[PDB]
């Protein structure tokens, strides 16, 4: 449709607002919050606003948030924090409680095997694809993801960016399970 001039200015203001927060938080504020209580999170994307800063665009892609509500098993450590804080305005990070991960895997589990949404319905699919990864079933997937097993990164690659379609632009902790409960 016909875009009105106010929308273009609103994009510029948000961009300048987005650019500023990025400049403060990253440069001269290298200190990071280091999320804890797990080795695995369930980050989701609230809304990637149009015309992102080019820094932002891969942060969704690399940690697998290329689409909205993409809940992914990410290795919880200091390393993800700065990248997530780069993308923190558009994401919610929270802990995948065992029930939430199991419930997600049991019903909404569509693991991105070969980059496609492959349902985790059959425990053999987890067993066959993750035989060397020690994940043998949906319950074992939770042990390898929610409990972040030895091959959690491989399990996460086996897993998918679960679209937990519904959110605050930051910490959730157990609130990711709340979204997962509604999503799954």
């Amino acid at each position: 449709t016909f875009k009105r001039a106010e929308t273009f200015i609103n994009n510029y203001r948000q961009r300048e607002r987005e650019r500023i927060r990025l400049n403060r938080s990253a440069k001269n504020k290298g200190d990071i919050f280091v999320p804890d209580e797990t080795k695995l999170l369930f980050v989701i994307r609230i809304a990637g606003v149009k015309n992102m800063p080019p820094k932002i665009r891969k942060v969704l892609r690399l940690l697998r948030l290329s689409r909205i509500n993409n809940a992914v098993f990410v290795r919880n450590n200091k390393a993800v924090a700065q990248m997530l804080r780069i993308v923190e305005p558009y994401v919610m990070y929270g802990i995948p409680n065992l029930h939430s991960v199991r419930e997600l895997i049991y019903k909404r589990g569509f693991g991105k095997i070969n980059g496609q949404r492959i349902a985790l319905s059959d425990n053999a699919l987890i067993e066959e694809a993750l035989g060397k990864y020690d994940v043998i079933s949906i319950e074992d997937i939770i042990h390898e993801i929610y409990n972040v097993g030895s091959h959690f990164k491989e399990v996460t690659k086996f897993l998918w960016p679960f679209t937990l379609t519904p959110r605050k632009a930051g910490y959730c902790g157990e609130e990711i399970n709340e979204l997962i409960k509604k999503q799954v």
Partner: protein
């Protein structure tokens, strides 16, 4: 209330016609939550299914348990009437369905309240699976008192609930959900002290 009274002249008619409602509730207890369905409705259906399983466990009304391809078929005798329910497996798989589910949930709640009153249990029960739902008071011996255990490959909680329903004490791994070791594979090594490798078919055959 009035619709259920007209549809079911007596509790015997409701019990005989609750097989479809029980099957629908069990199927919806593990179905994904979408726009067509409601999260609260799914939670209510799961609570009704848990209450029905707990009531069957206390009354030991379960008679047969068959491991079918579609799911677990449980046949129970309540007030003489035979009730058959199908429990689908936990696998990653509309207005009329929602209306039928709502009617089934209302019928299940009324049946659970009547069963709890007859057995003396409080309705609704206070709310780990069935462990959260406390049955506070207000084969029939398939595994008797054998303290069976389940690893993180068998139905675990489903095996525990099915055994506890008829006559058993099957276990469940903490993530998944001694005298026996329930596992998908034989897993002789996984069979712990006392826990002998328990194939689900063997337990189902003994129950049936």
């Amino acid at each position: 209330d009035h619709i259920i009274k007209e549809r079911y002249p007596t509790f015997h008619d409701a019990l005989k016609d609750i097989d479809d409602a029980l099957s629908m509730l069990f199927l919806f207890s593990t179905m994904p939550v979408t726009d067509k369905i409601g999260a609260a409705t799914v939670a209510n259906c799961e609570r009704l299914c848990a209450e029905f399983q707990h009531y069957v466990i206390r009354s030991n009304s379960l008679r047969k348990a068959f491991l079918s391809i579609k799911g677990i078929y449980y046949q129970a005798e309540i007030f003489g009437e035979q009730i058959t329910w199908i429990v689908p497996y936990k696998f990653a798989q509309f207005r009329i369905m929602h209306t039928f589910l709502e009617f089934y949930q209302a019928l299940m709640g009324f049946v659970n309240f009547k069963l709890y009153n007859t057995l003396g249990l409080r309705y609704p029960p206070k709310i780990a699976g069935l462990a959260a739902y406390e049955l506070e008071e207000s084969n029939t011996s398939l595994f008797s008192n054998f303290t069976f255990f389940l690893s993180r490959e068998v139905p675990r909680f489903s095996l525990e609930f099915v055994i506890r329903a008829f006559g058993g004490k099957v276990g469940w791994d903490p993530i998944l959900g001694i005298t026996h070791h329930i596992c998908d594979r034989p897993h002789i090594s996984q069979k712990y002290e006392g826990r002998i490798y328990i194939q689900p078919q063997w337990v189902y055959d003994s129950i049936n």
